[PDB]
Design an enzyme around this catalytic site. Structure first.
Site, short mmCIF file in Angstrom:
data_model
loop_
_atom_site.label_atom_id
_atom_site.label_comp_id
_atom_site.label_asym_id
_atom_site.label_seq_id
_atom_site.Cartn_x
_atom_site.Cartn_y
_atom_site.Cartn_z
N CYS A 109 0.89 -1.19 -0.03
CA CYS A 109 -0.10 0.04 -0.13
C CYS A 109 0.96 1.24 -0.01
CB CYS A 109 -0.79 0.02 1.28
SG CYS A 109 -1.78 1.46 1.29
N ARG A 112 0.29 4.54 2.89
CA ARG A 112 0.33 4.28 4.42
C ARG A 112 0.76 5.51 5.32
NH1 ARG A 112 4.13 -0.81 4.77
NH2 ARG A 112 4.50 -0.29 2.32
N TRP A 281 -9.20 6.91 -0.29
CA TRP A 281 -9.57 7.55 -1.39
C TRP A 281 -8.53 7.16 -2.54
CZ3 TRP A 281 -7.71 10.00 3.10
CH2 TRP A 281 -6.28 10.49 3.26
N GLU A 286 -4.96 4.36 -10.40
CA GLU A 286 -5.71 3.08 -10.01
C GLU A 286 -7.13 3.18 -10.99
OE1 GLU A 286 -6.12 1.91 -5.78
OE2 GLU A 286 -6.00 4.24 -5.44
C1 HEM Z 1 -5.96 6.85 2.42
C2 HEM Z 1 -5.95 6.79 0.85
C3 HEM Z 1 -5.03 5.25 0.42
C4 HEM Z 1 -4.66 5.06 -0.92
C5 HEM Z 1 -4.32 6.57 -1.72
C6 HEM Z 1 -4.03 4.02 -0.90
C7 HEM Z 1 -3.42 3.68 -2.16
C8 HEM Z 1 -3.42 2.13 -2.62
C9 HEM Z 1 -2.81 1.37 -3.80
C10 HEM Z 1 -2.58 2.56 -4.98
C11 HEM Z 1 -2.54 0.41 -3.67
C12 HEM Z 1 -2.45 -0.60 -4.73
C13 HEM Z 1 -3.66 -1.20 -5.37
C14 HEM Z 1 -3.60 -1.69 -6.52
O1 HEM Z 1 -2.96 -1.30 -7.44
O2 HEM Z 1 -4.63 -2.36 -6.92
C15 HEM Z 1 -3.18 0.09 -2.30
C16 HEM Z 1 -3.24 -1.29 -1.83
C17 HEM Z 1 -3.59 -1.83 -0.55
N1 HEM Z 1 -4.19 -0.93 0.46
FE1 HEM Z 1 -3.90 1.14 0.30
N2 HEM Z 1 -4.54 3.05 -0.02
C18 HEM Z 1 -5.40 4.08 0.81
C19 HEM Z 1 -5.92 3.56 1.90
C20 HEM Z 1 -5.96 2.30 2.50
C21 HEM Z 1 -6.66 1.78 3.74
C22 HEM Z 1 -7.33 2.76 4.63
C23 HEM Z 1 -6.47 0.51 3.86
C24 HEM Z 1 -6.85 -0.56 4.97
C25 HEM Z 1 -7.21 0.06 6.30
C26 HEM Z 1 -5.56 0.07 3.04
C27 HEM Z 1 -4.96 -1.04 2.56
C28 HEM Z 1 -4.24 -1.62 1.53
C29 HEM Z 1 -3.84 -3.11 1.37
C30 HEM Z 1 -4.28 -4.21 2.38
C31 HEM Z 1 -3.49 -3.03 0.06
C32 HEM Z 1 -2.85 -4.33 -0.66
C33 HEM Z 1 -3.72 -5.42 -0.88
C34 HEM Z 1 -2.72 -6.52 -1.38
O3 HEM Z 1 -1.90 -7.22 -0.58
O4 HEM Z 1 -2.89 -6.95 -2.40
N3 HEM Z 1 -5.21 1.10 2.23
N4 HEM Z 1 -3.30 1.10 -1.52
C1 LIG Z 2 -8.71 1.55 0.89
C2 LIG Z 2 -7.87 1.65 -0.51
C3 LIG Z 2 -7.61 2.97 -1.25
C4 LIG Z 2 -7.16 2.77 -2.45
N1 LIG Z 2 -7.04 4.16 -3.00
N2 LIG Z 2 -7.02 1.89 -3.22
C5 LIG Z 2 -7.16 0.54 -2.59
C6 LIG Z 2 -6.89 -0.92 -3.45
O1 LIG Z 2 -6.49 -1.93 -2.47
C7 LIG Z 2 -6.42 -2.81 -2.94
C8 LIG Z 2 -6.25 -3.39 -4.32
C9 LIG Z 2 -6.35 -4.76 -4.56
C10 LIG Z 2 -6.23 -5.00 -6.14
C11 LIG Z 2 -7.52 -5.34 -6.81
N3 LIG Z 2 -7.36 -6.20 -7.82
C12 LIG Z 2 -6.26 -7.17 -7.64
C13 LIG Z 2 -7.33 -8.36 -7.69
F1 LIG Z 2 -7.29 -9.04 -8.81
C14 LIG Z 2 -8.57 -7.36 -7.83
C15 LIG Z 2 -6.41 -5.87 -3.63
C16 LIG Z 2 -6.76 -5.45 -2.31
F2 LIG Z 2 -6.66 -6.45 -1.51
C17 LIG Z 2 -6.54 -4.08 -1.90
F3 LIG Z 2 -6.78 -3.81 -0.69
C18 LIG Z 2 -7.63 0.35 -1.37
#
Ligand code: HEM
Ligand SMILES: Cc1cc(N)nc(COc2cc(CCN3CC(F)C3)cc(F)c2F)c1
Ligand code: HEM
Ligand SMILES: Cc1cc(N)nc(COc2cc(CCN3CC(F)C3)cc(F)c2F)c1
Ligand SMILES: C[C@H](O)[C@H](O)[C@H]1CNc2nc(N)[nH]c(=O)c2N1
Ligand SMILES: C[C@H](O)[C@H](O)[C@H]1CNc2nc(N)[nH]c(=O)c2N1
Ligand SMILES: [Zn+2]
Lengths: 413, 420
Positions: A109, A112, A281, A286
């Protein structure tokens, strides 16, 4: 042991000691790296004891109370529950700390830097899908905040025997339907064709449009899931237009403002929260790169490039690259004009570097998955591209879990 | 393990890897930590630094000879058993051994094939190998390098080649090309504090001046060659300019682009790596192919600590540069990379765009899984530095592991050379 990571653009070097505290595997071995595998590969009493102890220990160390009277009684209290009930219940403070730290520990993520400003909604008293609906509606309304988006998570009851799981069947709280046509084409979001079909089968009457917000498919206590329509006034959407190309609005594109992942599992001290939807947000790419331009998704590159009169005969004109930039400009401009929170990928990656450096100073490191942290366009003109990163697995953590329609045994004949 | 599957999340193709069972060196990773984004994660080398003992060198020799005779459908043949005994006597009597021409060619091609970071490997078996093991002086190295550059440039129709100078002996008689690439531009540290030319080359540029090179002090000054033979002090040589093909960078729509005064050279020729074959170490092994446009247009031109021209292009484009969300960098970056490709193609100089290269690599991966049982690939390096997810490699899972023969990094010789 210490490990060093270098930024090859700035020459800054950080020293990671935090990796000494990880426990589950990465998937890699000493001789094979699996860093680009998407998914590499209930607890008994004796399994749960050390997992609980490790979590409680780290919580009490975080609040500078390790070894204290309250620390030792809490350990004893938890021990009792695992003996009496084969499980235990987190205090409210521990739940909040746990959910914040699962986010802090999410190596993939980039957002963070905000981890400690997470609004935690304790929904562990919920018993029915109607109650889940009510909790989720309040989450959406709170998180959306008329465009001034606020991070939030709503946590439903933990797993017990695996026969009574709470689950949101939706992969995100707001997603658009996809429908396959007989001629083989797709209407709406091709990613969601499967789940759209499940909803229809459960009784949902689809409008069959391009941007139909899916209903919530909610499972409480291991029962068959139930359909609910999010009230349309709670679903904030942004029509996409471009600041230069007047024709862009004529594509009829829009997107929802609130990203809300609802299919992950939150693991805290050995407990499994199988329903824990969380929201933040968007980063522009994305939507603008993946949602719109992945070949498996809305796939609008050719249409946009067409309207740009780009030479689509050979790839070396770079028409795809040129059109991808314009779409992502449109997404950011549209959200900003409607005062709906969004972050561009340059601002976001820059913050992540500040965040990462700060984490190395105060915590001794920061697990990070370069393959996921680097944005899907313009990689090397962002600071993270040049940033070495160590990837390792800390708990509390978010985890993938099976899709519920692959595991649920249906009740009603 | 048993068989590791890699999946492509666009096409759903799954490939099954058994070739990793032959991996020899550590990746740096463990079960608990992944180092896949570390530039140099591992110092696991197959031998001590310099002159090894018999029980250190012979097993690596036997491994490689065994592999080469297996590759040609022998193994246990008369020649194979004779080759083993001959390498045994040679090591007994010189503490090293010498490769046959076939073995050298096989090893060079397979080092390229095994290069998990190279997106160009579909061409691996079409590599011209120049045996330069009879070289003794820096002048002779210059002659070999000029012949390589002329053959490889081929009036724009570029051809992959490698020239292999004598292997390391005791570590004190190394052959080295001190240049990191055969053709690069100088970098000059200005008195105000900025940099003229290529910032990456400021240190090597200073060594060259500190060796008597007279810098013309332009932005695109082709650096001299600094050649070290048999451990002696290195010597400066000017590559004849008629052997240095250059492309002036213009744009097919922005007529003002040619007035930026940019050019680049046509031949990418890596000259600071070490080639390892059956325990032998070829510390001077310059190799060349042809550019992927992004290497110039994204990294060379737009890295912050390189030519850093984004803002100047974005200026002439009249883009909003107040805030990052206007994506003015992303927009200039595309135009610059259109210009580079358009310029090379206009001058009939071989170049490949990142869409064609990555598509070829997907095809190469399938070929390799089909015939070899796998293909080591470093995703962090294979995915192009722009437009990542609209190339097919972005959606391709890859296994990374270390096979031998291979190319290896080695220390910069000015960090280790004792001057005479
Ligand atoms: C606050 C604004 C946030 C932004 C801008 C953000 C941005 C992102 C982005 C760009 C990704 C990659 C997702 C993708 O390419 O599909 C990601 C993944 C992720 N986000 Fe964040 N996120 C935010 C908030 C959060 C919050 C609030 C949580 C949980 C409490 C979170 C948990 C995760 C997790 C667990 C992943 C990756 C899941 C995995 O292992 O595949 N995010 N986030
Ligand atoms: C809270 C938040 C904010 C933000 N800007 N973006 C995200 C996207 O997070 C995740 C994104 C993905 C990837 C989703 N595709 C991969 C799977 F094949 C479907 C998995 C996951 F487990 C996530 F958590 C979350
Ligand atoms: C023929 C056309 C070729 C193309 C288009 C090509 C392309 C590339 C690219 C884009 C990279 C990443 C480099 C970077 O980002 O700095 C790379 C790396 C590499 N290439 Fe190739 N290459 C070609 C030929 C060759 C040849 C002939 C060899 C050797 C015989 C070779 C060996 C390597 C090695 C060893 C690396 C990575 C070094 C490391 O491990 O860090 N390539 N190549
Ligand atoms: C023959 C050929 C053709 C072609 N198109 N590209 C290449 C790139 O080769 C290499 C490129 C680099 C990277 C150079 N520096 C930038 C980074 F900070 C280190 C290292 C290396 F070890 C290589 F081998 C080679
Ligand atoms: C930190 C990171 O590994 C480093 O910047 C890498 C990233 N990926 C790369 N990919 C290629 N092709 N070339 C590079 O130099 C790099 N640099
Ligand atoms: C095969 C590869 O691991 C896969 O395409 C990954 C690459 N990097 C990614 N990075 C992000 N942020 N999101 C993704 O879905 C992916 N997909
Ligand atoms: Zn790894």
């Amino acid at each position: 042991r210490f490990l060093k990571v270098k930024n090859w653009e700035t020459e800054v070097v950080l020293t990671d000691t935090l990796h000494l505290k990880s426990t589950l595997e990465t998937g890699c071995t000493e001789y094979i790296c699996m860093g680009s595998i998407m998914h590499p590969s209930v607890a008994t009493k004796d399994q749960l004891f050390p997992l609980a102890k490790e979590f409680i220990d780290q919580y009490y160390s975080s609040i500078k109370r390790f070894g204290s009277k309250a620390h030792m009684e809490r350990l004893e209290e938890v021990n009792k529950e695992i003996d009496t009930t084969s499980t235990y219940q987190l205090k409210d403070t521990e739940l909040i700390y746990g959910a914040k730290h699962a986010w802090r520990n999410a190596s993939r993520c980039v957002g963070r830097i905000q981890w400690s400003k997470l609004q935690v909604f304790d929904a562990r008293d919920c018993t029915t899908a109607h109650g889940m609906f009510n909790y989720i509606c309040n989450h959406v309304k709170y998180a959306t905040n008329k465009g001034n988006l606020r991070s939030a998570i709503t946590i439903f009851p933990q797993r017990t025997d695996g026969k009574h799981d709470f689950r949101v069947w939706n992969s995100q709280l707001i997603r658009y339907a996809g429908y396959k046509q007989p001629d083989g084409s797709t209407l709406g979001d091709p990613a969601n064709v499967q789940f759209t079909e499940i909803c229809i089968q459960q009784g949902w009457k689809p409008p069959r449009g391009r941007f139909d917000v899916l209903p919530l498919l909610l499972q409480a206590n291991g029962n068959d899931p139930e359909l609910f329509q999010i009230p349309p006034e709670l679903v904030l959407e942004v029509p996409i237009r471009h600041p230069k190309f007047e024709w862009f609005k004529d594509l009829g594109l829009k997107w929802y403002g609130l990203p809300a992942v609802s299919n992950m599992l939150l693991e805290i001290g050995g407990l499994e929260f199988s329903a824990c939807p969380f929201s933040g947000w968007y980063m522009g790419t994305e939507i603008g790169v993946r949602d719109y331009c992945d070949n498996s998704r809305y796939n609008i590159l050719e249409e946009v490039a067409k309207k740009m009169n780009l030479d689509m005969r050979k790839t070396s004109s770079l028409w795809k690259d040129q059109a991808l930039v314009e779409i992502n400009i449109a997404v950011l401009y549209s959200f900003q004009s409607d005062k709906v929170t969004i972050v561009d990928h340059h601002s976001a990656t820059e913050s992540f570097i500040k965040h990462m450096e700060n984490e190395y100073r105060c915590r001794g490191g920061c697990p990070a998955d370069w393959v996921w942290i680097v944005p899907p366009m313009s990689g090397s003109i962002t600071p993270v591209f040049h940033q070495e990163m160590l990837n390792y697995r800390l708990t509390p953590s978010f985890e993938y879990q099976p899709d519920p329609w692959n595991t649920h045994v249906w009740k009603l004949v």
